[PDB]
């Protein structure tokens, strides 16, 4: 019900978008071909879309406060205006006019728009060199891919932490420890429970003075420039919206070219043979800085090559 | 009984002499220089095998017993014992495959016991494989023509043929199984 999405007086956004969206009213038709194109159906879907994009989120919202309590301190970023699109491939269309033809990612329980942690993990890993599997259809792309990603991640690591030199093996071990929580060659490392990188679900945290959802058009003009283009309507997260990124990251210890846990690294330090030139460390703060720089560089969501889901610092 | 009718192959000679077959062709198949032993645990379970003291199988057997029996520090796996018993038919197929017998035995012992704990018992597995292959080779050399000619015999009853025909591969499997069980029986204390 109107603005200020709260746990007390508000309809579930996912329920409105997916379940209540295609509800049958006494005098609304979208089964026959005439009904889908009629202005009665357009008005029905316009009212539904207004209800969807008539909700605000306060900064001190109890939902976001609960998220902060559960998932630790958030990494807050802002939305540029292409908007932000997540879950675009979900099936949501009937062939009608004025309806949202693209899917959207809504949390089931809360209804707040969110980015699943899997999307964050994949986007962050995509700029790491070992995000591509050998397979055999990758063989040609694999050498160049790893090279450019190695250079990019090397400059990022030298930027964010006080390490003046890193190697390809060290980058491999760091990436595998961060994402797979293992070693590049299979076998695992005896990590502590705390020493584990978790990528929670990014959530909408603050729609300052406006709504959080907007409606946008992509109009693919066909390969025949003499035929009529297709207006496609979808739902986007509004620009200048605070998206909270929640992570559970640890400190990574790299001695020589291998990743070490804290228990192993204590004994390695206490050994009579040691080399500060071989012991590298990436603090959880520097890990968060690295992830923030990656997110600023590439962004999150769908249609990111078109620009959707790019961020600045808040 | 073990010394006479098993170790000295007097079952073969006695059974053939009772029916007046004997003759020089069968007498040349009489085998000697064998060790026969049985272990009756307090329950009624017999572990009985026989092996030739000529050739390398006996020395490999003795070295295995010296190796995996604890003193008063190579480690022994007890689950290989039940693999030998349960997978005896599969081991028979692998042994009878002449061309790739060693390779197939190694592959079988690797595909089974393919877990992390089994990397410390690679010495036991390969010792078992070599001893089994040697035992099968000696078994076939000693028994193949004997079994073939016993099968063709025209007056032997099926009961006598069955108690006289020794399968070359299953006897080797049983010998390895009994050796392993003797090692386990020596090693394991009721504590």
């Amino acid at each position: 019900m109107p603005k200020n999405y709260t746990l007390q007086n508000a309809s579930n956004l996912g329920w409105l978008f997916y379940k209540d969206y295609y509800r049958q009213e006494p005098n609304v038709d979208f089964i026959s071909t005439q009904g889908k194109e009629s202005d009665t159906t357009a008005d029905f879907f316009r009212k539904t879309n207004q209800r969807i994009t008539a909700y605000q989120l306060n900064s001190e919202s109890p939902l976001v406060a609960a998220f902060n309590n559960h998932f630790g301190t958030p990494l807050q970023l802002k939305t540029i205006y292409p908007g932000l699109i997540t879950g675009s491939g979900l099936p949501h269309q009937t062939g009608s006019k004025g309806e949202f033809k693209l899917g959207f990612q809504f949390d089931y329980t809360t209804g707040l728009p969110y980015i699943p942690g899997s999307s964050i993990k994949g986007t962050l890993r995509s700029m790491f060199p070992f995000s591509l599997k050998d397979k055999g259809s990758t063989k040609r792309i694999l050498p160049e891919y790893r090279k450019e990603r190695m250079e990019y991640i090397r400059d990022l690591i030298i930027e964010v932490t006080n390490i003046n030199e890193i190697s390809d093996t060290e980058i491999q071990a760091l990436e595998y420890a961060i994402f797979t929580n293992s070693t590049p060659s299979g076998k695992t490392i005896e990590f502590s429970l705390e020493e584990k990188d978790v990528f929670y679900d990014a959530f909408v945290a603050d729609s300052k003075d406006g709504v959080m959802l907007s409606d946008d058009y992509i109009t693919p003009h066909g390969e025949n420039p003499l035929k009529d283009p297709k207006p496609i309507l979808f739902l986007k997260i509004r620009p200048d919206v605070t998206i909270n990124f929640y992570f559970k990251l640890c400190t990574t210890h790299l001695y020589k070219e291998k990743v070490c846990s804290s228990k192993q690294i204590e004994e390695i330090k206490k050994q009579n043979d040691f080399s500060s030139s071989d012991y590298k460390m990436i603090t959880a703060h520097q890990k968060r800085n690295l992830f923030e720089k990656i997110l600023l560089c590439i962004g999150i969501g769908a249609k990111t090559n078109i620009g959707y889901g790019q961020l600045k610092k808040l | 009984y073990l010394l006479e009718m098993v170790a000295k192959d007097n079952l073969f000679k006695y059974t053939l002499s009772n029916k007046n077959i004997l003759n020089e062709n069968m007498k040349r198949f009489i085998l000697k220089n064998k060790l026969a032993f049985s272990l009756q645990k307090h329950s009624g379970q017999i572990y009985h095998t026989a092996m030739s003291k000529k050739g390398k199988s006996y020395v490999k057997f003795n070295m295995l017993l010296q190796k995996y029996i604890l003193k008063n520090s190579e480690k022994f796996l007890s689950s290989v014992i039940q693999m030998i018993r349960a997978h005896a038919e599969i081991l028979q197929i692998i042994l009878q495959n002449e061309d790739k017998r060693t390779e197939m035995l190694k592959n079988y012992f690797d595909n089974n016991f393919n877990e992390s704990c089994h990397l410390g018992y690679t010495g036991l597995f390969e010792d078992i494989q070599t001893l089994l292959c040697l035992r099968y080779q000696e078994n076939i050399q000693d028994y193949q023509n004997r079994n073939e000619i016993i099968q063709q015999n025209t007056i032997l009853t099926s009961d006598e043929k069955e108690i006289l025909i020794v399968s070359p591969a299953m006897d080797a499997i049983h010998t390895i199984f009994t050796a392993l069980q003797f090692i386990h029986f020596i090693n394991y204390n009721k504590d």
Binding site: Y18, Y21, Y22, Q24, I31, P91, T94, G95, G103 | -
Partner: protein
Amino acid sequence: MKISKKQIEYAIEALRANNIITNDNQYPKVFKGYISSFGAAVIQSGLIPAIIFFENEDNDANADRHKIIGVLKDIINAMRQQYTVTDATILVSSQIPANYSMAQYIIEHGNTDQLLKEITEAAVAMKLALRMYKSE
């Protein structure tokens, strides 16, 4: 959920009847994606939206996309044909009219769970039956 062999037989017969499997036991490659998309739409959006989307014939798609809805109706009719008198008192055993719009049939009969279960059964049967054939 376990798809019966009878359901697969009905799916095969319906695929052959609504000219999807050719006389050479081959089908257009896009129908597998059609059926997967229909299942995803049914679980995500609902029965009415998915059936309305795939019942359309003015769609400019690469193939006759309403054929899967026809096959759905044929499978459901065959399923309802073998209903027992014990089932007929609880379930709607009536044969769905051929000319009748499937979405209109669902809407006029409410949104009962029976139709949803039948649609899901028939969709999975269509998926498996299509997997049984070759895609040229």
